Every structure is written in structure tokens, then in C-alpha cells.
């Protein structure tokens, strides 16, 4: 009962190169040419079955670890999160560790986040956008605000003195540049010559050492993310080692650094284009009554329109293209069976362009709704739904409201940028993100 297979021209590659040159065109072509939302491609040539029919999403996002296993596709993350941590730990321990982190990012921790985010955005604009007008790279400035604001929400004063946002961002960038995403499926790529020595193992040790000194200094005489993590207790009564705590801190910062940056950038590139003037007017009608000091209720409860803006930016250009699982027990999807040992995948990129669920999918329409229930999967669904999503939305909406209150923006090109599918987390093409800001005062 197998899904149809896309023909393979080069057995050793399968489709990894066709996918890589244009994942959107490739995946739409398969789904169109095989006349099936559910179809199988080759990635060197491991079978990957894509559930590209939004009616079948729950069949991918609902099964538990025993049936659909996430960990096999993250072997590359081991040197980053740390040996034996997270995806390299036994499953019950992994679930507990991700859950400790989820607990640090609930509503209940957010009471002082909105002013901390605002103070930091404002400091960034005063320092970097200080003429009446100027030309910036919006994607780079969003990245800087996202790291700065995250640090101010999650890290205590003492930790920020040993490790400012700029040094944090350099450490994460070192750990990131060592990764070969395609090594998930072709681990021999790890054997190819590097232009430069990898600094991942060293960036992490350096972070772990700073964290250890902060911890010793705190014991000599604390409710930030580090402190929350230090009070966590496994069900067997033991606690996290420093190795583990460091792994979780890395995962939390690493997860949001591109995804959140990209979401903010897209939302601003859309809002500022002149054809979207009606939407920018609507955003202003939402925010123009707010006090200068926003609070949690303003952002969580009184920005429904800004949130539709953020969601629609992820719908149109989801920063995570594909989510994957090892099939541990055969599963039904639609009228097919997907066999044990396949990789199964569901792609936000593909599903978010399904013509039935999202008519005119290349149009950014913040007022649209999904026409297939559950077809938006930008933050996942079910068992592995994103645990960072409320924090990421708070952050992005808070930056929108803060920047648009004091500045106007002009995109220096005819159209909202093209997505650049060549990076593992996908955002607007970098050299298309030049923007002129105009300070409203002066
Ligand atoms: O950015 C990625 N991951 C990173 C690191 C990461 C991994 N797992 C996590 C779990 C929790 C937190 C972080 C991570 C990441 O930040 N992911 C992430 C997940 C959830 N929320 C926010 C961010 C990422 C992005 C793409 C990707 N691939 C792997 C395989 N290929 S490929 O060429 O071999 C291919 C396979 C199938 C079609 S093409 C494509 C890119 C692999 C990746 F790990
Ligand atoms: C806009 C920002 C984000 C986007 C667009 C996004 C996207 C996603 C997606 C698509 C999934 C599903 C993964 C799957 O089904 O395999 C997911 C899960 C997850 N995300 Fe995010 N994410 C974002 C921000 C964050 C942040 C800030 C964090 C942590 C600080 C985070 C941590 C996680 C974790 C721990 C999981 C679940 C891992 C699992 O159960 O295997 N995300 N996210």
C-alpha cells in the first residue's frame, strides 16, 4: 500500500540536490506530478515519505516517540547540546530535559519580560538608529535585537556581566558554523576537508566554564533561566549536571536565534512595503492607543492583529522547512502505509502552499484563515509542538510595537525579498534586506 515514489535519476544522491536548489519548486513538482499529497523521495537514497496533504497532518504530529521517533535526525546536534544530552539521551530523560526547559518559558515567567524587551529594543534604536534617517540591514538588526532582548529576559544581571549578548552571539555562531546539515543523511560529509578549524567543541566548553563560575559565585551568597534549570529535579530525584544545564541553555538560545529574527524581519518587510499600507494602517490602529510602557496584557491580549501579521509571515515563509521522524512501527497515512524504517516528514513549506488550505499561498494576507483545519504547522503540532512559541511571539510582537511607535521604514527595492532556501533556517535573502529608517521625531 506504498505512497508513490518520485523517480530517481542519480541513485547515490537521490533528490538531495534537486531539493536543495529549490525546495519549494521541487516539492510542489513531486506532489503535482505524482498526483498525490503523500509521496516518497530519496535523500542519498534513504526513503523519505512526505505527508504533504494537510488533511493527514495529525497522522504525523500525533503519534508518540515509540511510533514516530524524532531523535535519529538530530545526530548532528550532539556536539552542540552535549554528549548524552537531549537527543543523545535515553528518551524518558530527554522528555524530562525538554520539559524543564518548557517550564522556564511559560506565561508565569513572563511578568517582567515585556518591559525588559522594550528597554533593550529602545537602547538598540538609540544606539544604532540615531540620525533622522539612515540605511540599515534589517535582518542583521533584527538578529541583534532578538539576541539582546532574549538575554535580558532570560539571564540575570550577574550572568550578563560575564557574558554579554555580543559574546553570547559569537559563541553560538561558532557552534553553528561547524554543522553540516546534510550530514544527517550522508555522514561521510564529515570526512571532507574544512576551510577552517571547527570551534564548536571549544565554544561550548567556554560557555560551560562561565556558567560554572556564575554558579559557584551564586552559592557563595536567583530566578533567571539558569536558576530555574538549577532547581529542576528528575523524577528519580536526581538533578541536572552542569553539562546538561549548559546543553539546555544552548538549545534555548540556539532555537530562537534565527527563527525569531527571521519572523520579525519578514513581518517588518511585509508591513513596510507600500502595497501593504492598509495592513500597516491597521497595525497602527492597534498600537497607537498603547502607553509608552507596555505591559504583559497589552501584548498577550490586546494585539490580535499584530499576531495575525506574525503568523501569516511564518505561514508564507516558514523558517523551518521540514520536520522529520524515524518510523518505528508502520503507520497509515491517507490510503497508504508508510513502512518501518522510512523517514517520515511533514513540511511546513509544502503544506503552507497547498492550494485548498491556503488559496493564493504567495500572497501575504494577515486576514486569511486556514481552509483546512490544522494546515498551519509553523510551530509544529501535537506531541512535539514548539515549547518556545509563546516566548517567541511575545518577543516579536513586542519588537513590532516598539519599533513602529518611533520609526517608519522604507524598503529600498521594488518587492519584499526572495526567501533564501540555501540556509538550514530560511529567511529573506540577506542582501535584499536594506531598509531606510526615518525617525518620527526629527
Ligand atoms: O535548524 C535546524 N535545527 C536547529 C537546531 C535544532 C535541531 N533540533 C532542535 C530541537 C530543539 C531546538 C533546536 C534544535 C533549530 O534551531 N531547530 C529548531 C527546532 C525547533 N524550534 C526552533 C528551532 C535544522 C534545519 C534543517 C535541517 N536539515 C537537515 C537535513 N537536510 S538535508 O539536505 O539532508 C535534507 C533532508 C530532507 C530534504 S533535504 C535539510 C536541512 C536540520 C536542522 F537541524
Ligand atoms: C518563531 C520561532 C520558532 C519557530 C518558527 C519554531 C518552530 C518549531 C517547529 C516547526 C517545531 C516542531 C518540531 C517537530 O515537529 O519536529 C518546534 C518544536 C520545538 N521548538 Fe521551536 N520554533 C520557534 C521558536 C522556539 C524557541 C524560542 C525555542 C526554545 C527556546 C524552541 C524550542 C523548541 C523545542 C524544545 C521543540 C520540541 C522538540 C521536540 O519535541 O522534539 N522553539 N519548533
Summarize the structure.
The protein is α+β, with helices and mostly antiparallel strands and 442 residues long. The chain has a single domain, classed as Orthogonal Bundle (Cytochrome p450). It has helices at 16-21, 23-33, 57-61, 78-81, 91-103, 113-128, 138-154, 157-162, 165-177, 200-219, 225-230, 242-272, 277-287, 296-301, 304-316, 348-351, 389-406; strands at residues 38-43, 46-51, 68-69, 133-137, 323-327, 331-333, 336-338, 343-346, 407-411, 419-420, 427-428, 434-439.
How would you describe the overall organization of this protein?
With 442 residues, the protein is of the alpha+beta class. It has a single domain, classed as Cytochrome p450 (Orthogonal Bundle), CATH 1.10.630. Helices cover 45% and strands 11% of the residues. The protein has a 5-stranded mixed beta sheet with strand order 1-2-8-5-3. The protein has a 3-stranded antiparallel beta sheet with strand order 4-12-9. Strand 6 and strand 7 form a beta hairpin. Helix 9 packs antiparallel against helix 10 and helix 12 packs across helix 17. The longest helix is centred in the middle third of the chain and has 31 residues. The chain starts with 15 loop residues before the first helix and ends with a strand. The structure holds the ligand O=C(N[C@H](Cc1c[nH]c2ccccc12)C(=O)Nc1ccncc1)c1ccc(N2CCN(S(=O)(=O)c3cccs3)CC2)cc1F and protoporphyrin IX containing FE. Protoporphyrin IX containing FE binds next to helix 12 and helix 17. Pathway: Steroid biosynthesis; zymosterol biosynthesis; zymosterol from lanosterol: step 1/6. One of its GO terms (biological process) is sterol biosynthetic process. It is a single-pass membrane protein. Its EC number is 1.14.14.154. One of its GO terms (cellular component) is membrane.
Amino acid at each position: 500500500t506504498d505512497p508513490p515514489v518520485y523517480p530517481v535519476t542519480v541513485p547515490f544522491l537521490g533528490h538531495i540536490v534537486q531539493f536543495g536548489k529549490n525546495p519549494l519548486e521541487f516539492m510542489q513538482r513531486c506532489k503535482r506530478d505524482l498526483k498525490s499529497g503523500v509521496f516518497t523521495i530519496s535523500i542519498g537514497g534513504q526513503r523519505v515519505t512526505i505527508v504533504g496533504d494537510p488533511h493527514e497532518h495529525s497522522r504525523f504530529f500525533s503519534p508518540r516517540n515509540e511510533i514516530l521517533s524524532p531523535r535519529e535526525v538530530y545526530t548532528i546536534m550532539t556536539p552542540v547540546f552535549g554528549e548524552g544530552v537531549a537527543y543523545a539521551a535515553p528518551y524518558p530523560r530527554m522528555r524530562e530535559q525538554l520539559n524543564f526547559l518548557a517550564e522556564e518559558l511559560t506565561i508565569a515567567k513572563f511578568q517582567n519580560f515585556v518591559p525588559a524587551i522594550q528597554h533593550e529594543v529602545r537602547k538598540f534604536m538609540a544606539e544604532n538608529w540615531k540620525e533622522d534617517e539612515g540605511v540599515i540591514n534589517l535582518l542583521e538588526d533584527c538578529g541583534a535585537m532578538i539576541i539582546n532582548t532574549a538575554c535580558q529576559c532570560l539571564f540575570g544581571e550577574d550572568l550578563r556581566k560575564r557574558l554579554n549578548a555580543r559574546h553570547f552571539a559569537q559563541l553560538l555562531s561558532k557552534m553553528e558554523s561547524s554543522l553540516i546539515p546534510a550530514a544527517v543523511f550522508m555522514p561521510w560529509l564529515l570526512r571532507l576537508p574544512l576551510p577552517q578549524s571547527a570551534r564548536c567543541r571549544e565554544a561550548r566548553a567556554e560557555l560551560q566554564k562561565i556558567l560554572g563560575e556564575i554558579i559557584v559565585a551564586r552559592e557563595k551568597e536567583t530566578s533567571d533561566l539558569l536558576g530555574g534549570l538549577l532547581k529542576a529535579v528528575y523524577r528519580d530525584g536526581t538533578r541536572m549536571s552542569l553539562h546538561e544545564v549548559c546543553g539546555m541553555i544552548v538549545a534555548a538560545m540556539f532555537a530562537g536565534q534565527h527563527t525569531s529574527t527571521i519572523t520579525t524581519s519578514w513581518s517588518m518587510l511585509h508591513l513596510m512595503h507600500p502595497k501593504n499600507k492598509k495592513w500597516l494602517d491597521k497595525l497602527h490602529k492597534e498600537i497607537d492607543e498603547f502607553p509608552a510602557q507596555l505591559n504583559y496584557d497589552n501584548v498577550m491580549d490586546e494585539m490580535p492583529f499584530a499576531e495575525r501579521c506574525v503568523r501569516e509571515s511564518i505561514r508564507r515563509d516558514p523558517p523551518l522547512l521540514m520536520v522529520m521522524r524515524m518510523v518505528k512501527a508502520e503507520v497509515k497515512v491517507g490510503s497508504y502505509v508508510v513502512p518501518k524504517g522510512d523517514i517520515i516528514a511533514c513540511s511546513p513549506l509544502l503544506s503552507h502552499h497547498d492550494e485548498e488550505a491556503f488559496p493564493n499561498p504567495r500572497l501575504w494576507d494577515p486576514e486569511r484563515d486556514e481552509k483546512v483545519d490544522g494546515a498551519f504547522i509553523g510551530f509544529g503540532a501535537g506531541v512535539h509542538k514548539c515549547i518556545g512559541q509563546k516566548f517567541a511571539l511575545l518577543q516579536v510582537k513586542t519588537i513590532l510595537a516598539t519599533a513602529f511607535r518611533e520609526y517608519d521604514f522604507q524598503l529600498l527595492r521594488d518587492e519584499v525579498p526572495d526567501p533564501d532556501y540555501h540556509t538550514m533556517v530560511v529567511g529573506p535573502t540577506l542582501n535584499q534586506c536594506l531598509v531606510k529608517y526615518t525617525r518620527k521625531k526629527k
